[PDB]
Amino acid sequence: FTIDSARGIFPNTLAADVVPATIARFSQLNAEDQLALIWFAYLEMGKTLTIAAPGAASMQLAENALKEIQAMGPLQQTQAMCDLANRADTPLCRTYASWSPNIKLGFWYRLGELMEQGFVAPIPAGYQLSANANAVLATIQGLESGQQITVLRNAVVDMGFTGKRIAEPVVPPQDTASRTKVSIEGVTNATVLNWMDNLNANDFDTLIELFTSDGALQPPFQRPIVGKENVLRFFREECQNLKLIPERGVTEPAEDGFTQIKVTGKVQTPWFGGNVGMNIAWRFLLNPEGKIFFVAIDLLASPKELL
Ligand SMILES: CC1=C(/C=C/C(C)=C/C=C/C(C)=C/C=C/C=C(C)/C=C/C=C(C)/C=C/C2=C(C)C(=O)CCC2(C)C)C(C)(C)CCC1
Ligand SMILES: [Cl-]
């Protein structure tokens, strides 16, 4: 096995590839239609799902960009938002591209509040989506909530123009005494249990020691992130305050004393807490010493894909 060939383990696992399909269709749209479609999706989703407030540190890091937009005339505000959607080369688009996903999300959270209050130029009253945009919004509105929030996040992350990296401060790991231990039907493997428990505790320095030097982590619909430096950076920038709720799994040998393990269960993002449970598979390829050579996290097509 290489990292790229390990991508093929448990080929029965049906991922929610409607998510990248929908992002590809979204990406073709006119910029004003991209912004209007997300505005409509976010207004309707907000009737049943409450988004958690951005953290104080995130809002401070986005404050100067938000102040610049708030000082613009309405036409310039709309143009700045279109620049982000179009991935135009501007100072604002370069600042935005330097940000972690959580800072980008907090930026748009605040613009949404200001658009609702009427202090930043809103989507025009009575705005009608293009033929392609109406169909993209219909697809999004038919998806499970876990898939909807993944489409919105991926759309937000893809905006701006791509280098210096700006992320939220790393919060200290949970005190040992207060930590929870997961149980997984079928799976007693210490590496897998330690994975789940250390991520639930934000203990990234313990987590990274589970990997081989050349090991990789593959997030949903992304390429593998290879080696301890790049994986630890991903943990610290993007993986704080998750709740992993694994349910059940299966343990099999792989070539050369390797072990392949598949776990299914749910994950909560701190943006939605218990209000959105994403259906997830973990696919592990462990070397003979129990180190992680490869771990993939898949967003599942439906609850029918849970073991
Ligand atoms: C744009 C825009 C607007 C505002 C949009 C806003 C405000 C959207 C907000 C969206 C949000 C807040 C979405 C959040 C989604 C979060 C997700 C989907 C998280 C998933 C995490 C997972 C699945 C992690 C799994 C992992 C596991 C389990 C591991 O074991 C290892 C690590 C890792 C792989 C990370 C307005 C309206 C103004 C209109 C104009 C344009
Ligand atoms: Cl998150």
137 in the same domain as 28: yes
Cβ neighbours around 131 below 10 Å, total: 7
- Cα 270 to Cα 135, 149, 238, 277, distances in angstroms: 30, 12, 11, 11
Residue 82 CA from chain centroid, whole number: 23
Dihedral of CA atoms 104, 105, 107, 109 in degrees, nearest 10, equals 170
183 in the same domain as 131: no
Alpha-carbon dihedral sign for residues 284, 11, 136, 76: positive
What's the 152 CA to ligand 1 centre distance in angstroms?
6
Nearest ligand 1 atom to alpha carbon 155: 1
- Given 106, 128, 158, the domain boundary residue is 158
Contact between 29 and 136 under an 8 Å Cβ cutoff? The reply is yes
Q: Which two tokens stand for residue 153?
A: 């996040």
Q: Which two tokens stand for residue 195?
A: 């994975």
Q: Which two tokens stand for residue 60?
A: 């401070």
What's the 267 CA to ligand 2 centre distance in angstroms?
10
Resolution in A: 1.4
219 CB under 6 A from ligand 1? yes
Note whether residue 3 is domain-resident. no
Note whether residue 163 is domain-resident. no
- Given 135, 158, 181, the domain boundary residue is 158
Q: For the stretch 224-242, what's the b/e string if a residue is b when 16 or more beta carbons lie within 10 angstroms of its beta carbon? A: bbbbeeebbbebbbbbbbe
Q: Which two tokens stand for residue 190?
A: 């210490």
294 in the same domain as 247: yes
Tally the C-alpha atoms within 13 A of residue 149's C-alpha that lie toward its C-beta.
24
Q: 257 in the Ramachandran plot: left (φ > 0), alpha (ψ -120 to 50) or beta?
A: left
* Residue 238 to residue 167: CA distance in whole angstroms: 8
Contact between 243 and 200 under an 8 Å Cβ cutoff? The reply is yes
1 CB under 6 A from ligand 1? no
What CATH number should be reported for the domain holding residue 74?
Answer: 1.10.2090.10
Q: Which two tokens stand for residue 198?
A: 């250390």
221 CB under 6 A from ligand 1? no
Residues in the chain: 307
* Residue 244 to residue 251: CA distance in whole angstroms: 19
Q: Which two tokens stand for residue 124?
A: 């025009």
Cβ neighbours around 245 below 10 Å, total: 15
DSSP string, the chain: --HHHHTTSSTT--B-THHHHHHHHHHTS-HHHHHHHHHHHHHHHTTT-PPPPPPHHHHHHHHHHHHHHHHS-HHHHHHHHHHHHHT--SHHHHHHHTB-HHHHHHHHHHHHHHHHHTSSPPSPTT----HHHHHHHHHHHHS-HHHHHHHHHHHHHH-S-----B----PPPPPGGG-----BBTB--HHHHHHHHHHHTT-HHHHHTTEEEEEEEE-TTSPPEESHHHHHHHHHHH-TT-EEEEEEEEEEE-GGG-EEEEEEEEEE-TTTGGG--EEEEEEEEE-TTS-EEEEEEEEBSSGGG--
Note whether residue 24 is domain-resident. yes
How open is the CA angle 301-6-283, to the nearest 5 degrees? 45
Q: Which of 46, 101, 18, 59 is CA-nearest to residue 276?
A: 46
User: Which residue bears the tokens 């980008």?
Assistant: 104
Proximal ligand: closest to the CA of 53:
1
Give every CB contact of residue 245 below 8 A, 6+ residues apart in sequence.
182, 265, 266, 267, 268, 277
Which structural technique was applied?
X-ray
Nearest ligand 1 atom to alpha carbon 219: 34
What's the 75 CA to ligand 2 centre distance in angstroms?
32
Residue nearest ligand 1's atom 18 by CA: 150
Q: How many domains does the chain have?
A: 2
Residue nearest ligand 1's atom 27 by CA: 297
* Residue 139 to residue 199: CA distance in whole angstroms: 32
Q: Which of 91, 115, 52, 68 is CA-nearest to residue 241?
A: 52
What's the 55 CA to ligand 1 centre distance in angstroms?
14
How open is the CA angle 299-233-182, to the nearest 5 degrees? 50
196 CB under 6 A from ligand 1? no
243-253 and 259-268 beta bridge pairing: antiparallel
* Residue 143 to residue 45: CA distance in whole angstroms: 11
Dihedral of CA atoms 243, 282, 253, 10 in degrees, nearest 10, equals 160
150 CB under 6 A from ligand 1? yes
* Residue 18 to residue 301: CA distance in whole angstroms: 8
Note whether residue 7 is domain-resident. no
- Cα 2 to Cα 108, 211, 221, distances in angstroms: 39, 15, 19
* Residue 255 to residue 216: CA distance in whole angstroms: 18
139 in the same domain as 180: no
129 in the same domain as 60: yes
* Residue 60 to residue 243: CA distance in whole angstroms: 25
- Cα 70 to Cα 33, 106, 129, 159, 281, distances in angstroms: 22, 15, 26, 19, 42
125 in the same domain as 38: yes
